[PDB]
Amino acid sequence: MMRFMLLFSRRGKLRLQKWYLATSDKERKKMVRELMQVVLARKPKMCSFLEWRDLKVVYKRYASLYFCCAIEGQDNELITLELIHRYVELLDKYFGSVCELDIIFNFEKAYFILDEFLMGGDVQDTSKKSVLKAIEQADLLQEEDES
């Protein structure tokens, strides 16, 4: 199970936060500033995994944007790395040649995709094609309301 997933910039700016468990807003913020401090403080060629606060933390930096998952001790780091990569592949296909700025201006869409790829702390669909199609159709249904 993934406790939470964060996307934050190199300069410590939050781009996305998905909490797969119940926590007070205040505590969520404390966690975010703390974890972000710790991860960002690390030198570029450090290990993509670290032990933070009785949990395991996986992080990968794509361009300027940091993807950071908090996994439970019984979970596989390398596979979570793989799920993160899948997520950025989903984003890449959706926005097309995805950059941080797209996530900045379309954070709602990013949440959408993330929710069509994960749930409760686990993957729900291990196909890129399935997820992307789902989001596509949902966007069509949404565009229907306008027109």
Partner: peptide
């Protein structure tokens, strides 16, 4: 910043 436009994947 410039890298805000850079491709995540490429």
């Amino acid at each position: 910043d410039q890298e805000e436009l850079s491709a995540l994947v490429e």
